[PDB]
Amino acid sequence: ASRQRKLEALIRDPRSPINVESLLDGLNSLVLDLDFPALRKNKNIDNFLNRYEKIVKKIRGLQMKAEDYDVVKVIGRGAFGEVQLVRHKASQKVYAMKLLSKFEMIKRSDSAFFWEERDIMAFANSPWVVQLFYAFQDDRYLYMVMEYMPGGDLVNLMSNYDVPEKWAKFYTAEVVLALDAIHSMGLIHRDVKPDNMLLDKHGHLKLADFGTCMKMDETGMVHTAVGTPDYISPEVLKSQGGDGFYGRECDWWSVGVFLYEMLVGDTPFYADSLVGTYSKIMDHKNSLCFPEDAEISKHAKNLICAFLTDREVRLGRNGVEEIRQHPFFKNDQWHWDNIRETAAPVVPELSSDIDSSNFDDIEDVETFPIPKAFVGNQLPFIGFTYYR
């Protein structure tokens, strides 16, 4: 039949919401939401659960789960969970596994952010994005098994090394190509910073933490929770108070803040309080001054000022090409088409497959209540499971 080929095409497609893994999540979520002593007083619910008792226990055994991975060490912490350095028990392969608590996401009213984060890492097929091999879930958490990045974040690098300009040219250029890939996918990052810039086994850049990512409207804009204030742009610091819009330019601001921090040493709009940091970002024409002691070229000064302006005249409105032709980026080391295949400034010297010397030691769990009626706490997480 002509309709049956169209139906089988939808189920085979991994982007589709009615794939085999998503359909299995629907069944697991339905049984998890229904299987309680109170809800089994309903005749329809009791007879359904008894039919699907044995097969759901079988599928839970066969499907991927937290018990398949040994937790080596906690390597990062966030709002709704943590990032664990893990080893798969069967294959002995090392991964970085991000956890996200379902209770905390439901409680704090933020349970849509992970969809774009899963899709960016799973489906970008880009060397600038951290690849997602497996996504899975249980009653408590969502899991995202990713390629481990043993070189560590760019906060680690700036603390340990006094960064010269040739190194800054490299890492900025990689950030430019990384954001261009995200902008090409139809997305604004909203939270570009050294914490979200990770270094691989070879010392080359990939981006992680795509929680603040939102898909652009048809114009190239987006219309509500924010990152750290040091790297946030002034147009974002007005839109948060009542409606407001902003485009890809807000990411390019943060590249200017990033390029300032490596060369100078401190953040350009730094203050003791948070209110001071916000005020300096709004007054960026007057407050942006380069320290006289600081070792910075004229071209790098020019590029930071080109990024750190009002949105309407900023560098990166009219494509990436104007950023790429800027004289700062000229060198006799790499070109734009081959930067990721050249030798990195800092190649990590790693002692083992579970070496986390480039990550700092992380310092050290309420569940859902057993409900009276149907609440549907697992329904927002149907479709999350993914197998490469």
Active site residues: 191
Shortest spacing between CB 245 and ligand 5YK, in angstroms: 24
Mark 127-156 with x for binding to ligand 5YK (rule: CB under 6 A) and - for no binding. Answer: ---x---------------x-xx-------
* Phi, psi values for residue 311, rounded to 5°: -50, -40
Q: Say whether 75 counts as a known binding-site residue.
A: yes
Q: Which is nearer to a copy of itself, 27 or 271 (CB)?
A: 27
First to last CA, the chain: 30
Q: Does 365 bind a copy of itself (CB under 8 A)?
A: no
Q: Of residues 217, 341, 376, 388, which one binds a copy of itself by CB under 8 A? A: 376
Q: Cα 380 from chain centroid?
A: 20
Euclidean distance between CA atoms 367 and 181, whole angstroms: 38
Shortest spacing between CB 33 and a copy of itself, in angstroms: 9
Q: Of residues 194, 211, 256, 316, which one binds ligand 5YK by CB under 6 A? A: 211
Q: Of residues 30, 76, 129, 323, which one binds ligand 5YK by CB under 6 A? A: 76
Q: Does 39 bind ligand 5YK (CB under 6 A)?
A: no
For residue 146, the SS3 value is strand
Which range touches ligand 5YK (CB under 6 A), out of 5-13, 41-49, 207-215, 277-285? 207-215
Q: What DSSP state is assigned to residue 205?
A: E
Partner from ligand 5YK, a copy of itself, none contacting 38, C-beta within 5 to 8 A by type: none
C-alpha dist (Å) from residue 26 to 20, 32, 373: 10, 10, 19
171 within 8 A of 194, measured Cβ to Cβ: no
Which range touches a copy of itself (CB under 8 A), out of 53-61, 153-161, 250-258, 327-335? 53-61
Euclidean distance between CA atoms 95 and 66, whole angstroms: 13
Tell me the torsion sign for CA atoms 291, 295, 297, 301.
negative
Partner from ligand 5YK, a copy of itself, none contacting 282, C-beta within 5 to 8 A by type: none
Kindly give, in sequence order, each residue whose CB lies less than 8 Å from that of residue 167, ignoring residues fewer than 6 positions away. Answer: 161, 262, 345, 346
Q: Does 199 bind ligand 5YK (CB under 6 A)?
A: no
C-alpha dist (Å) from residue 371 to 33, 50, 103, 177, 349: 9, 20, 14, 49, 52
Tell me the torsion sign for CA atoms 58, 64, 68, 74.
negative
Q: Which is nearer to a copy of itself, 34 or 179 (CB)?
A: 34
Q: What DSSP state is assigned to residue 381?
A: G
Token pair of 188 as six digits = 């604004």
Euclidean distance between CA atoms 219 and 358, whole angstroms: 41
Q: Of residues 3, 15, 285, 298, which one binds a copy of itself by CB under 8 A? A: 3
* Phi, psi values for residue 255, rounded to 5°: -70, -40
Euclidean distance between CA atoms 267 and 331, whole angstroms: 26
Q: Of residues 66, 94, 106, 362, which one binds a copy of itself by CB under 8 A? A: 106
Q: Does 388 bind a copy of itself (CB under 8 A)?
A: no
Residues that constitute the known binding site for ATP: 75-83, 98
Binding footprint of ligand 5YK on the chain (CB under 6 A): 75-76, 78-83, 96, 98, 100, 130, 146, 148-149, 198, 208-209, 211
Residues in contact with a copy of itself by the rule CB under 8 A: 1, 3-4, 6-7, 10-11, 16-18, 20, 23-24, 26-27, 30, 34, 42, 44-45, 47-48, 51-52, 55, 58-59, 61-63, 90, 106, 111-112, 373-377, 379-380, 382-383, 387
